[model samples]
Target: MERTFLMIKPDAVQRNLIGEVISRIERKGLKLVGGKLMQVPMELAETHYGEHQGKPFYNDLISFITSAPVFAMVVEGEDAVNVSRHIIGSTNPSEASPGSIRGDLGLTVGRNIIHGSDSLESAEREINLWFNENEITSYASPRDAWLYE
Candidate 1:
């Protein structure tokens, strides 16, 4: 199985879409290994989005994320890195397809409702950045046998 990091941004929390987002992942059959709602510190936000540091939107990105609480989670499933991104949709809401998280909830790039690691490397980095080693738990689900070969 693969693992990915997924976050419901501050906007989603303010809009009360936490359950809606969690439901989508559950309906897709992914396992939620860990999750929590917390107010992200500025330093953590900086590290989480560090790659976009020098970009024009960097300041706004940091400010927005730290403005309110966010829900962060670690999800696991086959191809989770790719699947989570599909659920999140494009960074640009206008271009996001119907039924996607962003398509349904996002209004602008900066206000996109969620964020998912775009690759395996990003997944590992993000999971570590947002969660402690002890935060992750492992267990077997009856459905896993059927889900995997």
Candidate 2:
């Protein structure tokens, strides 16, 4: 199975949208292998956004993420990376599709409701940074037969 890392960002947590967001992912037939609700540690945030470290928004990205509790998850499915990205919508909520998470729930780019790994490489990096090996579990879901061919 393909895996991807997803986070319900600070703004979404602050506004109580965690369940709403998770619902969409689950409704899309993805399986959650691991999840947690925690306040992001500064070190974790810094490392997570390290690629953006030299950019102007780097500091802001770190600050916003560490400011509140977030729901971080490891999801698995066929094409998990691409599937979750489509569910998350565009970075700019204003331009996101109406049925997407950002379009339905977010407003500005800075406060976009969620984050998803952009590719398999990114997913591997992110899932490792966020979760310890023992934290994630794998098992067969009875519904899998219905969800997949």
Candidate 3:
């Protein structure tokens, strides 16, 4: 199974949609290997969003992420990176499809409820930054045999 990193952003946490979002992934038959609810420090947030550091909205992005608590997670499944990306939808909620996370729950471009790694490289890098090796696990889900072909 491939792995992906995801985060239920502060807005989603405060809005009480953490469970709702998690349910979607569970229904997809993905395994949750690790997760945590924690406050993001400014420096770490900056690093996580480093690719956007020189952009005009970088400061606001950092400020928003570090403003409150977030639920971070690492998931594994067949094509998890792409699957989660599909579930997450477009960055701009208005542009996302009706059933996607952003399309269903989000309204603003800047306040979209979650973040997922964009590529395998990003997944590895972001997972490394957010979780240590010990934070994750390896186990066969009873239903995994059916989850993948």
Which window of ten consecutive residues has the lowest lDDT sum in model 1? Answer: 139-148
Pairs with backbone N, CA or C atoms under 3 Å apart (clashes), candidate 3: none
Tell me the TM-score of model 1.
0.96
What tens-digit string does per-residue lDDT give for candidate 1 at 1-149?
69999999999999999999899888888899989999999889998888988999999999999999999999999999998888878989999998988998889988999999999999999998899989999879988988879
Tens digits of lDDT, candidate 3, 1-149: 68999999999998999999999888977899989999998889988999997998988998899889999999998898999999999999999999999999999999999999999999999999999989898898789778667
Between candidates 1 and 3, the TM-score winner: 3
TM-score of each: 0.96, 0.97, 0.97
Candidate 2 lDDT by residue in tens digits, 1-149:
99999999999999999889999999999999999999888889988988888987887888899899999999999999999999899999999999999999999999999999999999999999999999999999989999889
Write out the backbone clash pairs for model 1: none
The numbered model that scores best in lDDT is 2
Q: Which ranges in model 1 have alpha carbons more than 4 Å from their true place?
A: none
Output the lDDT of residue 96, model 1: 93
Which sequence of candidate numbers ranks them by lDDT, best first? Answer: 2, 3, 1
lDDT of each: 0.91, 0.94, 0.92
Q: How does residue 35 of candidate 2 score in lDDT? A: 98
RMSD of 1: 1.0
